């Protein structure tokens, strides 16, 4: 039903766009170019949002895993004082960004 | 990607819904493989089209038995076959 | 040489920090056969509906038998008696 509601929103917005363009009847070239460069701006914004969210997740996981590995090495060596606490990570496993 | 987020983008757990995150990861892999299959499926057909156009182009240059056998060929024209075919292709591609 | 369970439980809480001295580097591919599937994922609803169209079947939901049947028939007759 959420998909249905979003489809209804898409349908009404598309119909509104069609009627607005058929009413304005402005020249294609310049107005189209306006459309493409702000479409590109929006696309780059979405892409960088996605990439930087993934960057946050990746750096947080590396941070937490490296904290655990240092704690393990120190407690193996017998250093009993542990200092730093883990950050709210969602995914824990062996991976690349450790060494 | 899935090495660092294998799960997504508080009571006890029942056995039926016990593996849902693993099924999420499985479904992610399935979707990626289906995308791979779609991309390939378009690539091989475009490659076949390129092979066909290349072959008929080489035929266009050469003087070959199949070139003569094709009744629509500039190398030897009878009863305006070539001209009729050209105007038909023009009206079909118009 | 530890067991797999011991090795996974030891480092961190389910991880492994390989020392650079062993030279076992499986977590990093040689970059020759590298894998990156992010580009293939659809960015438009056209691509989304096309992927939905692809593969709907998975989207939706002897002599030994004869010998065993003979043995079960005989034992059932014996139980009847």
């Amino acid at each position: 039903k959420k998909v249905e509601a979003l489809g209804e929103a898409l349908e009404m917005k598309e119909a509104q766009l069609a009627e607005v363009l058929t009413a304005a009847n402005l020249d294609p070239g310049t107005l189209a170019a306006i459309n493409q460069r702000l479409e590109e701006v929006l696309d780059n914004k979405n892409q960088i949002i996605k990439a930087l969210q993934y960057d946050v997740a990746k750096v947080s996981k590396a941070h937490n895993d490296l904290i655990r590995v240092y704690e393990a090495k120190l407690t193996e060596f017998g250093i009993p004082v542990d200092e730093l606490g883990f950050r709210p990570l969602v995914t824990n496993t062996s991976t690349g960004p450790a060494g | 990607q899935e090495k660092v987020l294998p799960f997504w983008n508080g009571s006890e757990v029942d056995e039926w819904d016990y593996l849902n995150c693993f099924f999420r990861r499985y479904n992610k892999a399935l979707l990626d493989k289906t995308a791979i299959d779609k991309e390939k499926s378009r690539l091989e057909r475009e490659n076949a089209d390129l092979r066909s156009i290349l072959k008929q182009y080489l035929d266009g240059i050469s003087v070959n038995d199949d070139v003569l056998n094709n009744p629509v060929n500039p190398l030897l024209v009878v009863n305006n076959r070539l001209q009729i075919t050209l105007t038909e292709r023009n009206k079909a591609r118009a | 040489k530890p067991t797999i369970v011991e090795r996974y439980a030891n480092y961190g809480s389910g991880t492994y920090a390989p020392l650079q001295r062993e030279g076992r580097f499986p977590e990093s591919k040689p970059l020759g056969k590298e894998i990156e599937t992010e580009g293939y994922a659809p960015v438009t609803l056209k691509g989304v509906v096309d992927l939905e169209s692809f593969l709907p079947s998975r989207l939706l939901n002897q002599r030994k038998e004869a010998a065993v049947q003979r043995d079960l028939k005989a034992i059932n007759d014996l139980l009847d008696t």
Binding site: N92 | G10, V13, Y18, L19, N20, C21 | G14
Partner: peptide
């Protein structure tokens, strides 16, 4: 549990 699909893991008593 903690790696694949636990979401929570609890030791027994003894």
């Amino acid at each position: 549990h903690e790696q694949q699909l636990g979401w929570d893991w609890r030791p027994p008593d003894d």
